[PDB]
């Protein structure tokens, strides 16, 4: 009975849903840091 209560709650709360992709070019959010990946990756050369 509890499982059926939960299943029917699910069947009422279930529906379609909007779904989106977001392409996050991390070079941009690195440009927000002005330390962008292109030169933030090559300079990293150490066995630290």
């Amino acid at each position: 009975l509890n499982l059926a209560e939960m299943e029917q709650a699910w069947l009422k709360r279930d529906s379609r849903s909007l779904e989106v992709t977001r392409t996050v070019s991390l070079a941009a959010v690195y440009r927000t840091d002005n330390v962008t990946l292109a030169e933030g990756i090559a300079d990293l050369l150490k066995g630290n």
Binding site: L11, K12, D14, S15, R16
Partner: protein, 48 residues
């Protein structure tokens, strides 16, 4: 109306006893209304 010995010369008062009553108890049909259907909603899944 007795005899010389005081014994009654008449026939005694007989009394037909009562027939034991037939027991009778209450018997009633169970009564109850139906239940109304719940509110409807279009689910997430198709009909099949």
């Amino acid at each position: 109306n007795l005899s010389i010995d005081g014994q009654p010369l008449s026939l005694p008062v007989f009394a037909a006893p009562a027939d034991p009553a037939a027991l009778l108890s209450a018997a009633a049909a169970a009564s109850g209304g139906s239940k109304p259907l719940p509110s409807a909603d279009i689910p997430a899944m198709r009909f099949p």
